[PDB]
Write a protein that binds this DNA or RNA. Structure first.
Length: 1156
RNA sequence: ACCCAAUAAUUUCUACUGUUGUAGAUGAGGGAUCUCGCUCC
């Protein structure tokens, strides 16, 4: 198996040596903000938008179908939808001319409306949250944090930005006023104020904030500035219009009366200093200027509506002549008669449709109605000469506006772009460490000229570095970059090379090639061959001449790949006093690259990240065409000190001072790129993924791991072997008993409460951090004891085991060892903060003073609450089918001991489909339960349950050595009764939760990785990883909305990890998976590389041997099959993983029945 | 002098914790048979 090409983000700490310049920007980034004003403006804006999108009709409030959308928006937010649309059109061959005047609208896209409505509702909810926050009376810091978080959430690339995009890229055919312009204008102010707010309230994000950008490639930086404002004004001047000249721009010879009517209508706005302009300029925030386009639109719409209303009323011809609809009152009485006849036909068809009794007949009537409507529209569009002329005129006008607009948009874009790339980048090496050097934009020419004159590389401890790289996209941006403005010097030079029209006109844009790969290939070949080009670009001419130029390719992909592959070079020079000279002459900025590790000579180990960076500079990596590559662009961020506590010194740490931070991108195994999968048509997806899987073979799978499914704390892991598949129960059980063979080593802490004292007189607890104990060196250094004492302590404290299964909850890796009980504090913290979160949520509701009364009863103790708990744990859809007696039986089943009632097989089967997950609630794990129904001391009747029931917490079996039993009850109870004294916001608690979850997954990842490696090495083959239930595809609603959903997190993380080894298909995000085929098929399997999924069939507690038996409370199977769990598995709860693995493997085998 | 009993060596988290610190984990779903326009539902 061979690795892919992979890209990882990387960070570093920066220390300032001399930063006089760069600092200026930071100074200039200061802004002002006002909370209340922002909230009010956002509320008003959101109020207005609804009138834009949503159409009338209380029966169904929904987004107008007929709304039009540009391709642009879709490509940034609706990838999948777009793709689907394309395929739909393409496949169907609804394109009998291979290029067309295409148009599209919302109603033309499947499911888009639901998406847009959801986004709008989410934004409204966030706005309400901000309003409440503003009106809040919390403590100062609390408030500040809350606000910050809210802003953060609001500002994400799933939010307001999206809406703005939508707005900016949409239009209405039937607008009557001028709302769209107002929304367009207000968008910019909202954006700027959001920016300001972010700036203000969030100066202490872990990543800091962007301040400047730099790149290594000389291509981009050398861009000289352009006086955009003057060109802006020049362009703007073209919109000036004289009222008399409006009709002189078209060939339509409108009647004098009609033209006078239009003039009067336009003159209606000739007042109050209003200035008439051809179009509209949002970019300049124009207001109090009237756009002719909009006026014509309005006139069109209004007269159309009036005419339709008149026909719907069946008024006479003479009455039409008396109307003011000058655009339509000029038609013939014959045309009016034909139109009225068609309208009467439509009325009859509608009456019949209302009289329709069958779907097919109604469909036929609707088709006839559509045909008649098309006939009416054809007649209207053909016969109405005045309408025609109006339309023509309108069209004439329209185009011009856009013309100018596009140019303006481009200019703006360009300006925005150029405002970023301030500095050219260089790296200096000295005494085994690296300094970062930035050169100002304006000195780049002299800097480049000077460097080229220096001597070549020399064997000395001082050196300088500078890159040069070429990529397909880079080249394309060079070639066709903003050619419209004529600012692209490069594009000028190459002009003679381009293809020509029939007219001999040079077509200065990519569309000239009409999608022919064979043409694009040849063109870039030529380009490269171009003498001019070679002057600006430094490239391996010798190699490329044969490898690129003088070659042919099957598809664009190969060319792309090749180009990307070869074009990468690195240079160095040496000279005395370079550091001084650069700062002296070119205003050079200097940074010191530093790390916690980089400083230390203890090369014992280093963080993962660090290894990459060090490996890059090694001599060997140079020979292999830089198997590790560094991207050409970088970012700089700044972070303010968070200091908000009273004085007494505390200690030195990060966050106590301002810090500069570096951002880069690095790649691995670049020599072997591959087409990265993304959102695609299902067919392509399936074909690709299946092709990848065939790389394996049936007989290469030596082993498999099962990951179980359960509640919030995660659950057990175990292995399976082919050999286990014996013929008889006796042989099976005998085989299984060979644990000594097939097993793996683990460690257990004998005593959680062990402790010792250091030379400092400070206590150390084993359960706080095993590391300080296990590791010989650490122990020695900390406690100065002898090696013999070390050995004695180790053998006394620690116990060894060999097992097939593991409790993954507490599992942790330490110094090449597996520890079952290694990490308690993490798990304790998770359960405690989950409990507080839910108690907070419950007390948040029932804000009205009647019977608030949470009771924390630790027991159900009453009916009508059991039912509600059952309701809470079960699926609605399945739950609805049960009768009250069935419900009761359900409850009993849930709560009652397994042997109390002889549940029928049908009852069991139906039950099993109800619950989300299984677990004991009476006798094993003693989880405390909440309800709030208690007005008065409880009674079987009354005491309405609608105040809800909730699953709070769990007692771990050791309690903990942490804290004390009495105090945990107190802590949890306190959290209900004493809300006020706890100074934490809901909106932040979620965040704090998330991380904890996030962190804890790490341990799991590590353990699985370790075991995988181990087994692989031992056996010399690849293994299968099986997980119960495909989760990522779900809704994730409610509490979960911002809580993580632990299994989802694991799902993604695990996948990510494996990606390195190249054992899974190159999927960029898991969301793309077409997981529909899994549901309800015990024999089914979904395969992704070596990773797979199976349905949750509820096989738990199923005997591994005899299948029939049930394992509840005894290590020995009650079915007398000879099976015993004592010697094999840590606990009976390991059993679920084993079954999972078995089943999965079996399925895997079966799938290749008709393929291998 | 007990309640706003909280915080705490890191590129950054999580446990811990003070001057050779220790354990595990760790990236970013944005690109050209164009662009911008007009009927009718």
């Amino acid at each position: 198996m061979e690795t892919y090409k992979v890209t990882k983000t990387i960070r570093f700490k920066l220390e300032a040596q001399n930063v006089p310049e760069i600092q200026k920007d930071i100074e200039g980034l200061q802004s002002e903000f006002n909370l209340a004003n922002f909230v009010s403006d956002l509320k008003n804006y959101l109020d207005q938008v609804r009138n834009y999108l949503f159409s009338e009709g209380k029966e169904h409030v929904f987004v107008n179908n007929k709304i039009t959308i540009k391709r642009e928006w879709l490509q940034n937010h609706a990838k999948q939808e777009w793709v689907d649309f394309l395929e739909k059109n393409k496949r169907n061959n609804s394109l009998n001319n291979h290029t067309r005047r295409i148009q599209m609208s919302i109603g033309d896209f499947t499911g888009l409306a639901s998406k847009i409505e959801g986004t709008f509702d989410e934004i409204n909810s966030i706005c309400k949250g901000l309003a409440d926050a503003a009106g809040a009376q919390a403590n100062k810091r609390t408030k500040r944090e809350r606000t910050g978080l809210l802003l953060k959430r609001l500002q994400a690339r799933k939010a307001l930005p999206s809406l703005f995009s939508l707005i900016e890229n949409s239009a209405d055919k039937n607008e009557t006023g001028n709302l769209s312009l107002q929304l367009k204008n207000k968008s910019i102010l909202i954006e700027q104020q959001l920016a300001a707010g972010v700036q203000t309230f969030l100066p202490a994000q872990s990543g800091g904030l962007p301040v400047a950008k730099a790149s290594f490639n000389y291509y981009t930086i050398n861009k000289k500035p352009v006086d955009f404002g003057n060109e802006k004004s020049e362009l703007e001047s073209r919109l000036k219009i004289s009222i008399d000249t409006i009709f002189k721009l078209t060939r339509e010879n409108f009647s004098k009366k009609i033209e006078e009517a239009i003039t009067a209508d336009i003159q209606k706005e000739l007042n109050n200093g209003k200035t008439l302009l051809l179009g509209d300029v949002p970019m300049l925030g124009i207001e109090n200027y009237v756009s002719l386009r909009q006026i014509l639109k309005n006139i069109k719409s209004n007269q159309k509506k009036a005419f339709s209303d008149l026909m719907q009323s069946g008024k006479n011809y003479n009455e039409l002549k008396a109307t003011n609809l000058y655009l339509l009152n000029t038609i013939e009485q014959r045309q009016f008669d034909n139109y009225k006849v068609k309208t009467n036909e439509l009325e009859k068809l509608a009456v019949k449709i209302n009289q329709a009794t069958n779907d097919n007949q109604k469909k036929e009537l609707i088709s006839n109605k559509q045909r008649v409507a098309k006939q009416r529209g054809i007649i209207m569009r053909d016969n109405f000469a005045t309408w025609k002329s109006f339309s023509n005129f309108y069209r004439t006008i329209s185009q011009e506006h856009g013309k100018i607009l596009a140019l303006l948009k481009g200019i703006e874009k360009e300006r925005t772009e150029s405002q970023l790339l301030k500095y050219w980048a260089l790296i200096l090496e000295n005494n085994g460490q690296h300094k970062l050097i930035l050169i100002p934009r304006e000195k780049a020419a002299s800097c480049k000229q000077w460097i080229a004159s220096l001597n070549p590389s020399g064997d000395k401890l001082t050196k300088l570095f500078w890159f040069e790289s070429l990529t397909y996209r880079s080249l394309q941006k060079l070639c066709f970059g903003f050619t419209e403005n004529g600012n692209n010097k490069f594009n000028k030079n190459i002009q003679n090379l381009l293809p020509k029209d029939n007219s001999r006109k040079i077509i200065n844009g990519e569309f000239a090639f009409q999608g022919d790969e064979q043409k694009k290939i040849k063109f870039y070949q030529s380009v490269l061959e171009s003498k001019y080009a070679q002057s600006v670009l430094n490239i391996p001419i010798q190699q490329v001449q044969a490898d690129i130029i003088n070659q042919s390719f099957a598809s664009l992909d190969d060319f792309q790949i090749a180009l990307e592959k070869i074009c990468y070079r690195l240079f160095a020079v040496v000279e005395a006093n370079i550091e001084a000279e650069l700062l002296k002459n070119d205003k050079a900025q200097i940074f010191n690259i530093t790390s916690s590790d980089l400083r230390k000579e203890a090369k014992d180990k280093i963080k993962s990240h660090t290894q990459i960076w060090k490996a890059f500079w090694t001599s060997e990596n140079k020979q292999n065409n830089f198997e590790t590559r560094l991207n050409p662009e970088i970012t700089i961020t700044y972070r303010q000190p968070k200091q908000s506590k009273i004085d007494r010194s505390q200690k030195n740490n990060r966050y106590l001072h301002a810090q500069y931070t570096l951002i880069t991108t690095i790649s691995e195994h670049s020599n072997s790129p591959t087409k990265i999968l993304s959102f695609m048509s299902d067919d392509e997806f399936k074909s690709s993924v299946d092709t990848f899987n065939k790389k394996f073979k049936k007989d290469e799978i030596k082993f498999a791991f099962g990951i179980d499914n359960g509640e919030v704390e995660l659950s057990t892991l175990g292995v399976y072997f082919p050999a286990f598949d014996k013929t008889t129960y006796k042989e099976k059980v005998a085989e299984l008993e060979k644990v000594n063979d097939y097993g793996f080593e683990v460690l257990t802490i004998r005593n959680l409460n062990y402790k010792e004292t250091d030379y400092n007189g400070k206590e150390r607890k084993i359960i706080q951090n095993p590391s300080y104990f296990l590791k010989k060196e650490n122990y020695l250094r900390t406690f100065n004891k002898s090696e013999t004492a070390y050995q004695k302590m180790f053998t006394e404290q620690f116990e060894k085991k060999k097992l097939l299964t593991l409790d993954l909850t507490t599992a942790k890796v330490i110094c090449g060892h597996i520890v079952t009980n290694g990490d308690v504090p993490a798990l304790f913290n998770l359960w405690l903060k989950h409990a507080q979160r839910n108690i907070f949520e419950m007390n948040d509701h029932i804000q009205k003073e009647t019977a608030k009364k949470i009771v924390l009863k630790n027991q159900l103790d009453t009916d009508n609450e059991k039912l509600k708990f059952a309701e809470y744990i079960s699926k609605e859809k399945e739950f609805g089918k049960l009768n009250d007696d069935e419900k009761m039986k359900y409850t009993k089943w849930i709560f009652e001991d397994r042997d109390q009632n002889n549940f029928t097989e049908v009852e069991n089967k139906k039950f099993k489909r109800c619950q989300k997950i299984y677990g004991n609630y009476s006798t094993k794990a003693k989880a405390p339960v909440l309800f709030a129904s208690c007005f008065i001391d409880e009674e079987l009747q009354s005491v309405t349950d609608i105040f809800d029931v909730r699953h709070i917490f769990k007692k771990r079996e050791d309690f903990y050595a942490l804290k004390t039993e009495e105090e945990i009850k107190q802590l949890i109870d306190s959290y209900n009764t004493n809300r006020a004294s706890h100074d934490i916001s809901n909106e932040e608690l979620d965040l704090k939760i998330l991380n904890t979850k996030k962190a804890l997954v790490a341990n799991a990842v590590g353990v699985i990785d370790f075991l995988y490696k181990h087994y692989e090495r031992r056996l010399g083959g690849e293994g299968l990883i099986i997980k119960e239930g495909f989760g990522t595809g779900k809704v994730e609603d409610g509490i979960e909305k911002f809580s993580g959903n632990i299994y989802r997190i694991l799902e993604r993380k695990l996948y990510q990890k494996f990606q390195n080894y190249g054992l899974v298909p190159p999927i960029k995000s898991l969301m793309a998976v077409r997981a529909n085929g899994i549901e309800n098929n015990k024999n089914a399997i979904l395969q992704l590389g070596n990773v797979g999924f199976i349905d949750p069939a509820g096989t738990s507690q199923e005997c591994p041997v005899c299948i029939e038996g049930r394992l509840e409370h005894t290590t020995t199977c009650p079915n007398k099959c000879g099976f015993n769990s004592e010697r094999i598995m840590h606990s009976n709860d390991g059993i679920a993983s084993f079954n999972i693995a078995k089943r999965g493997f079996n399925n895997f085998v079966k799938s290749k029945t008709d393929k291998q």
